[PDB]
């Protein structure tokens, strides 16, 4: 702790309209120091993916200046395997979530309220993953 390792200047994130991009490579560099991030996947040959887009872009900003903060970014599965295989990703456009490091999946009506409605629901200090996991990779 405390190394300070900075030249390369490797490690960075972009973003989209407030759309982060995430990779396996600043995958958990930047969920470092996040108690909830959001993960949305999708694809390039994913034509119904064009549609959200937009829709998407403006449920960043929404959950941008909510309380508590949260920081809406994007990932690529088809160029992130290993992302992809840790949320068993097999389908798009596939959403989901990220508490400390426990992937929540998400199920319902993927829109500007529902998505929001999880997302800023698990934030809460207070809200606490269900039963059924469905895959635990040494949670802890």
Same mark, same amino acid.
């Given at each position: 702790?405390?190394?300070?390792?900075?030249? %390369?200047? &490797?490690?960075?994130?972009?973003?989209?309209?407030?759309?982060?991009?995430?990779?396996?490579?600043?995958? &958990?560099? #930047?969920?470092? %120091?996040?108690?909830?991030?959001?993960?949305? #996947?999708?694809?390039?040959?994913?034509?119904?993916?064009?549609? #959200?887009? *937009?829709?998407?872009?403006?449920?960043?900003?929404?959950?941008?200046?909510? %309380? *508590? *903060?949260? /920081?809406?970014?994007?990932?690529?599965?088809?160029?992130?395997?290993?992302? /992809?295989?840790? #949320? &068993?990703?097999?389908?798009?456009?596939?959403?989901?979530?990220?508490?400390?490091?426990?992937?929540?999946?998400?199920?319902?009506?993927?829109?500007?309220?529902?998505?929001?409605?999880?997302?800023?629901?698990?934030?809460?200090? %207070?809200?606490?993953?269900?039963?059924?996991?469905?895959?635990?990779?040494?949670?802890?």
């Amino acid at each position: 702790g405390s190394s300070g390792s900075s030249g %390369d200047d &490797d490690l960075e994130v972009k973003e989209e309209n407030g759309v982060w991009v995430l990779n396996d490579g600043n995958f &958990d560099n #930047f969920v470092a %120091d996040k108690d909830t991030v959001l993960l949305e #996947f999708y694809a390039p040959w994913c034509g119904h993916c064009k549609q #959200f887009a *937009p829709e998407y872009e403006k449920i960043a900003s929404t959950l941008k200046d909510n %309380d *508590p *903060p949260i /920081a809406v970014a994007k990932i690529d599965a088809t160029s992130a395997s290993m992302l /992809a295989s840790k #949320f &068993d990703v097999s389908g798009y456009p596939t959403i989901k979530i990220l508490k400390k490091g426990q992937a929540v999946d998400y199920d319902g009506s993927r829109t500007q309220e529902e998505i929001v409605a999880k997302v800023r629901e698990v934030s809460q200090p %207070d809200w606490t993953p269900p039963p059924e996991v469905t895959s635990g990779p040494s949670s802890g």
